[PDB]
Amino acid sequence: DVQALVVDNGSGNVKAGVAGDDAPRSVFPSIVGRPKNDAYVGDEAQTKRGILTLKYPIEHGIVTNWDDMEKIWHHTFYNELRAAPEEHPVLLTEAPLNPKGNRERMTQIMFESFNVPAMYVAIQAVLSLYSSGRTTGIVLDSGDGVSHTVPIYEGYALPHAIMRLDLAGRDLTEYLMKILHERGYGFSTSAEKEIVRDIKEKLCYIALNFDEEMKTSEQSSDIEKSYELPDGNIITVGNERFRCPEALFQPSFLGKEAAGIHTTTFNSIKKCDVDIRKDLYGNIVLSGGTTMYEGIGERLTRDITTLAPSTMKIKVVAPPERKYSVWIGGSILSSLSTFQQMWITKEEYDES
Amino acid sequence: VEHPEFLKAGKEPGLQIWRVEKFDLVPVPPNLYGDFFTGDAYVILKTVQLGNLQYDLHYWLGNECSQDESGAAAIFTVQLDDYLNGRAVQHREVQGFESSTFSGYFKSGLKYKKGGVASGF
Ligand SMILES: Nc1ncnc2c1ncn2[C@@H]1O[C@H](COP(=O)(O)OP(=O)(O)OP(=O)(O)O)[C@@H](O)[C@H]1O
Ligand SMILES: [Ca+2]
Ligand SMILES: [Ca+2]
Numbered sequence: 190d191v192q193a194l195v196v197d198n199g200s201g202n203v204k205a206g207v208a209g210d211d212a213p214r215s216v217f218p219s220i221v222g223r224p225k226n227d228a229y230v231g232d233e234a235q236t237k238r239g240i241l242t243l244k245y246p247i248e249h250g251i252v253t254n255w256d257d258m259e260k261i262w263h264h265t266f267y268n269e270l271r272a273a274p275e276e277h278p279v280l281l282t283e284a285p286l287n288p289k290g291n292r293e294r295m296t297q298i299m300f301e302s303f304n305v306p307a308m309y310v311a312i313q314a315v316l317s318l319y320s321s322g323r324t325t326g327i328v329l330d331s332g333d334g335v336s337h338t339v340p341i342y343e344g345y346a347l348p349h350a351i352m353r354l355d356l357a358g359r360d361l362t363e364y365l366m367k368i369l370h371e372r373g374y375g376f377s378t379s380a381e382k383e384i385v386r387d388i389k390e391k392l393c394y395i396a397l398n399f400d401e402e403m404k405t406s407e408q409s410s411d412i413e414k415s416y417e418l419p420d421g422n423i424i425t426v427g428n429e430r431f432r433c434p435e436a437l438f439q440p441s442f443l444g445k446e447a448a449g450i451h452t453t454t455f456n457s458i459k460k461c462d463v464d465i466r467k468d469l470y471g472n473i474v475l476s477g478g479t480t481m482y483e484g485i486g487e488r489l490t491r492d493i494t495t496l497a498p499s500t501m502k503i504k505v506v507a508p509p510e511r512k513y514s515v516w517i518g519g520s521i522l523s524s525l526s527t528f529q530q531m532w533i534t535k536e537e538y539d540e541s
Numbered sequence: 542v543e544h545p546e547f548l549k550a551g552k553e554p555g556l557q558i559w560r561v562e563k564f565d566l567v568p569v570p571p572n573l574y575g576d577f578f579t580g581d582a583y584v585i586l587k588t589v590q591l592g593n594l595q596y597d598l599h600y601w602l603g604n605e606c607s608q609d610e611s612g613a614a615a616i617f618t619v620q621l622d623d624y625l626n627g628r629a630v631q632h633r634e635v636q637g638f639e640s641s642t643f644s645g646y647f648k649s650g651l652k653y654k655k656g657g658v659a660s661g662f
């Protein structure tokens with residue numbers, strides 16, 4: 190009789206909790222701070238930024254500082270969940286196209302540092318598709334550090350068709366910081382960045398037609414919306430509200446030559462054989478925090494409809510809890526009567 | 542990956558219906574076949590004798606089913622297909638928009654009921 194722990198590690202935040210809950214009970218920043226002259230994690234690291242050098246162990250969805258990642262996992266088990274990792278099965282998530290060597294390192298740490306008794310590694314986008322009640326579709330997962338388009342057919346990702354875009358929410362926060370200089374604001378420090386991130390989440394939206402929105406917004410002050418800063422000062426944001434997330438569609442705004450999210454989704458579908466494309470176009474599922482902008486579904490629908498053959502039926506699905514759809518999918522999967530047969534046990538791992 | 546109901550799946554021509562109940566796959570009483578609770582999600586396996594057997598898996602989502610139920614119905618569909626060596630064709634069926642193939646499995650046609658089993662969430 191044992192309940193699995195579900196941990197979804199992102200570039201910006203970790204989501205953690207117990208199988209069978211409808212949402213993660215723990216969400217904290219994926220940050221490790223160590224003295225400038227042993228380590229602090231998450232919210233406590235930010236409250237001590239003056240004393241610590243802060244680092245992000247996950248870059249563009251890939252674990253890249255293993256020592257600090259181990260600190261994140263220790264904090265998850267001991268300080269957030271108060272769970273003995275050696276006494277629970279664990280479901281852990283990984284990015285699309287995560288190298289097998291990285292999964293192997295993640296597994297070694299879980300079995301040999303934390304002594305987990307059993308573990309299962311799931312692909313984030315696949316969990317999100319399941320949380321939407323689908324086995325076939327294409328997931329557009331846009332987080333803080335990376336965006337992926339992942340075609341999935343009858344339950345399994347098609348690896349040769351997955352796209353990775355390094356543009357995601359943190360680039361958008363930084364772009365908002367940049368364009369607010371037009372108005373005289375000089376947000377630049379790590380703490381100011383977390384304020385601008387909140388402005389972005391509260392005030393931004395995606396225009397249905399960017400050129401037309403620029404024109405209408407210039408004709409009155411109705412575009413302008415206010416935001417109360419921590420110091421009590423008020424900031425007014427205008428067309429920055431939609432110019433900021435427009436960079437998802439026009440990465441040149443950021444000085445990137447990358448294709449936008451609409452083109453990338455189209456290209457990902459085209460990599461799949463023609464006989465399954467209809468099911469992908471009809472099941473474009475949004476996932477992750479950077480897909481939360483008002484207007485995103487309508488805009489993507491227009492733009493992908495333009496690109497795709499006119500015989501296709503384009504349907505963009507925007508689940509309301511999609512900020513946590515990976516974690517939710519993991520909670521469902523690890524609750525099923527069959528999960529016990531999917532995991533790898535420590536004894537199996539240790540004997541090779 | 543097995544399960545007692547997996548062991549019974551697709552052994553003979555016919556129609557098998559399971560309801561998702563608290564993260565598990567529970568047989569629907571045969572007297573109820575064709576009636577579907579709008580609050581629930583179900584997995585349906587149609588087995589046809591060709592020499593070999595042909596398999597169509599449908600997962601049916603009621604308009605009021607909870608996220609755990611629709612998610613589990615999708616996952617169990619994948620797992621059943623895997624148990625059938627991938628040879629099943631999977632079909633998503635939404636209340637009121639089901640394929641003619643799926644409706645055709647029920648001589649009395651598809652009908653819906655208010656209610657359903659409690660969410661696992
Ligand atoms: N309502 C919102 N509107 C716009 N952006 C949002 C909203 N809510 C959260 N975000 C952005 O979503 C990002 C975090 O999303 P998520 O938690 O999916 O990323 P992650 O899993 O930490 O990162 P990744 O998946 O890139 O490794 C941040 O950039 C955050 O500002
Ligand atoms: Ca993520
Ligand atoms: Ca129900």
Ligand SMILES: [Ca+2]
Nearest residue numbers: 622627628629
């Ligand atoms: Ca199949």
Ligand SMILES: [Cl-]
Nearest residue numbers: 494495497499
């Ligand atoms: Cl077109």
